Amino acid sequence: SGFRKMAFPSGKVEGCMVQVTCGTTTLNGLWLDDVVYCPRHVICTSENPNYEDLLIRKSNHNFLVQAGNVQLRVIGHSMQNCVLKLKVDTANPKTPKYKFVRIQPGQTFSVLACYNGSPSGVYQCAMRPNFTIKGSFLNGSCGSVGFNIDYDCVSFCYMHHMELPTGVHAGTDLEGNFYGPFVDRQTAQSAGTDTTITVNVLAWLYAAVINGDRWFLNRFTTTLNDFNLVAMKYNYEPLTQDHVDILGPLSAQTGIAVLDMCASLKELLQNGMNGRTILGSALLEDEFTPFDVVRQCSGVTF
Amino acid sequence: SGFRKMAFPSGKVEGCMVQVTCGTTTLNGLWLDDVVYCPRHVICTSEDMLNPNYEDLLIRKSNHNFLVQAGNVQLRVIGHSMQNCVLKLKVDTANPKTPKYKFVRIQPGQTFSVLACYNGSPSGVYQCAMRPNFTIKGSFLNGSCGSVGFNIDYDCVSFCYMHHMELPTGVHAGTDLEGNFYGPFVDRQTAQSAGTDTTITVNVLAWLYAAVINGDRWFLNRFTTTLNDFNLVAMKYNYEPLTQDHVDILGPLSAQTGIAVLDMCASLKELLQNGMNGRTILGSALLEDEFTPFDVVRQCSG
Ligand SMILES: *C(=N)[C@H](C[C@@H]1CCNC1=O)NC(=O)[C@@H]1[C@@H]2[C@H](CN1C(=O)[C@@H](NC(=O)C(F)(F)F)C(C)(C)C)C2(C)C
Numbered sequence: 368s369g370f371r372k373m374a375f376p377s378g379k380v381e382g383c384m385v386q387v388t389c390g391t392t393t394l395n396g397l398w399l400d401d402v403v404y405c406p407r408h409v410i411c412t413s414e415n416p417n418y419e420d421l422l423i424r425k426s427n428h429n430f431l432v433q434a435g436n437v438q439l440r441v442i443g444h445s446m447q448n449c450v451l452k453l454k455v456d457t458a459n460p461k462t463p464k465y466k467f468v469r470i471q472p473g474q475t476f477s478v479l480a481c482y483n484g485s486p487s488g489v490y491q492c493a494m495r496p497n498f499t500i501k502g503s504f505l506n507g508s509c510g511s512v513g514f515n516i517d518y519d520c521v522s523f524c525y526m527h528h529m530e531l532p533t534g535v536h537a538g539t540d541l542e543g544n545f546y547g548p549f550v551d552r553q554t555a556q557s558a559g560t561d562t563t564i565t566v567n568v569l570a571w572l573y574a575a576v577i578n579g580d581r582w583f584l585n586r587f588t589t590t591l592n593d594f595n596l597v598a599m600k601y602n603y604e605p606l607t608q609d610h611v612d613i614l615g616p617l618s619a620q621t622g623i624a625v626l627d628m629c630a631s632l633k634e635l636l637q638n639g640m641n642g643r644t645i646l647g648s649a650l651l652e653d654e655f656t657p658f659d660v661v662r663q664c665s666g667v668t669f
Numbered sequence: 670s671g672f673r674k675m676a677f678p679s680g681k682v683e684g685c686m687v688q689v690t691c692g693t694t695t696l697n698g699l700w701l702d703d704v705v706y707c708p709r710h711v712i713c714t715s716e717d718m719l720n721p722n723y724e725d726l727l728i729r730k731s732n733h734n735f736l737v738q739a740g741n742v743q744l745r746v747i748g749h750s751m752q753n754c755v756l757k758l759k760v761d762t763a764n765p766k767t768p769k770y771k772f773v774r775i776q777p778g779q780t781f782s783v784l785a786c787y788n789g790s791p792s793g794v795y796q797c798a799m800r801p802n803f804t805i806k807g808s809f810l811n812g813s814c815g816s817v818g819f820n821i822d823y824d825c826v827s828f829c830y831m832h833h834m835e836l837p838t839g840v841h842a843g844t845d846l847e848g849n850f851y852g853p854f855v856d857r858q859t860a861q862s863a864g865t866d867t868t869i870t871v872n873v874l875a876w877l878y879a880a881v882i883n884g885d886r887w888f889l890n891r892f893t894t895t896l897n898d899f900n901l902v903a904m905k906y907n908y909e910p911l912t913q914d915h916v917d918i919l920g921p922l923s924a925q926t927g928i929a930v931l932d933m934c935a936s937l938k939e940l941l942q943n944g945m946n947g948r949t950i951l952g953s954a955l956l957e958d959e960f961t962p963f964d965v966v967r968q969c970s971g
């Protein structure tokens with residue numbers, strides 16, 4: 368039994384973390400084959416940066432690349448969107464099987480927080496609908512990566528770039544394309560209003576049922592339209608026919624039809640939790656996907 | 670910024686996890702140097718589960734009755750010894766991935782990371798605390814047994830928990846790596862139960878100090894309290910009594926925020942008398958007791 372906020376084992380990714388230094392700026396790089404990936408704002412001096420020019424003007428020896436106590440020699444450099452690629456003289460002997468993926472809002476991943484190329488902590492995250500993440504990042508955390516594991520293949524999906532005024536976090540996929548309407552300048556930027564990831568709440572209520580927690584279940588059923596009208600009143604994501612099909616395995620497993628569980632969720636939105644908890648939370652949790660619930664409640668290895 | 674339940678990177682422990690088989694029972698082992706440590710109930714059949722005589726079953730085992738497997742490689746068992754409730758298996762090869770490690774027995778309130786493993790392959794990593802009643806609120810299915818709890822201090826791994834059994838209230842019990850149970854439990858399928866759990870008061874106060882540091886002050890008041898008056902009230906809410914020792918430990922957080930420990934205790938007191946009233950601290954509508962004073966300083970300062 369049990370239900371925990373659970374990260375992927377971070378071992379495969381720890382074998383890839385390095386330290387990148389430019390003048391006085393130090394942050395983290397992802398060392399895969401003979402290339403080190405890191406945010407391009409590493410090159411930046413104190414003084415609206417012109418990255419293209421700052422990059423082309425700069426020699427190879429200006430990039431100090433440190434893998435533990437070993438120096439890596441940079442033998443090339445190129446830009447891809449908002450990520451800098453440093454061509455190194457050594458293929459990473461610890462390189463796992465990996466692909467770069469870009470994730471949709473509501474999709475979850477593990478962040479490996481690092482400082483000075485040194486992995487510090489791992490935590491589970493969700494891509495918010497406003498494309499921010501509620502992470503935990505201090506100074507030097509930039510270049511820290513988000514990832515999933517599928518068997519032995521690490522799918523890297525996130526590189527950390529910045530903290531927003533609301534204490535929430537912004538970054539790019541490993542191809543340097545920002546998630547959300549952001550720019551890597553010190554310019555004034557702000558998270559749009561977040562919404563609750565409805566399908567995830569429903570998956571987590573299924574996790575509640577599976578662990579013997581049933582007080583919120585009722586005998587009513589609703590329709591998508593009625594549910595979706597109530598949802599957008601509480602800043603909940605619309606529920607699609609897609610979502611309903613993806614929760615099917617959980618509906619089948621528990622014997623509770625999705626459109627019933629939507630009625631249960633509706634009552635909770637309108638009525639609150641009545642001084643009760645669900646899986647030990649006073650808040651409806653939306654950072655577990657349907658897959659996450661199936662993975663944890665079936666067990667799955669790598 | 671941000672405040673996340675945060676586990677240690679699992680790489681150094683992933684390198685040590687093995688699968689141990691005896692008869693039809695397979696669970697997980699911890700492979701350190703030329704010893705595999707695992708729960709001794711791996712040698713129990715179905716019948717044995719109620720009043721196992723461990724000495725009488727192990728005296729009936731040869732080395733070759735224990736299958737130890739590391740990935741594809743089957744390890745060769747060359748000696749078997751019992752220490753309390755862990756079995757120690759001497760093996761041909763010393764684990765080359767052996768990190769700096771020590772074995773540590775922790776006290777209730779102390780936190781660690783759990784690497785949930787099945788068939789010697791890791792499933793996920795989460796962060797736990799030893800509950801006052803010597804149980805943990807884990808996430809463990811069939812065959813999770815021998816999964817370990819650890820902390821990492823620089824590059825030294827300290828092993829503090831090995832997983833043995835699930836109690837009827839869906840909470841978990843285990844031993845230190847010397848095989849002495851945390852709490853009054855025994856590795857038998859006889860009727861046993863956890864004492865009533867209490868809230869880890871020192872940890873909730875730590876979490877409140879973090880809240881101020883991350884800029885949230887909605888909950889403070891202008892009162893102070895005596896240590897005795899605090900405990901007289903706090904026990905009435907099933908809180909762990911606060912000791913002078915605990916007050917000493919909070920000194921640094923008290924210094925950094927400028928809020929006296931007994932002033933913070935007045936705040937906590939009022940929160941219990943009222944509750945949240947729809948408001949939250951650090952994204953929670955409950956009081957968090959699974960961050961220690963050390964955890965908070967590490968994640969918010971440096
Ligand atoms: C190890 N592979 C399992 C794992 C359990 C069940 C799912 N999550 C877990 O932590 N553990 C066991 O097989 C141990 C083992 C005998 C019985 N047992 C139990 O987990 C049982 N609990 C108790 O012994 C009891 F009653 F005291 F709570 C069970 C009732 C099956 C849950 C031994 C030797 C303790």
Ligand SMILES: CC(C)(C)[C@H](NC(=O)C(F)(F)F)C(=O)N1C[C@H]2[C@@H]([C@H]1C(=O)N[C@H](C=N)C[C@@H]1CCNC1=O)C2(C)C
Pocket residue numbers: 394408504505506507508509528529530531532536550551552553554555556557670
């Ligand atoms: C909040 C701050 C003023 C620091 C700024 N944010 C904004 O620019 C905004 F406020 F305008 F949004 C910001 O983070 N950066 C400024 C500069 C890079 C980025 C940066 O160096 N990031 C930190 C790096 N190791 C990570 C931080 C530390 C604490 N928690 C984090 O995550 C770039 C946007 C090019």
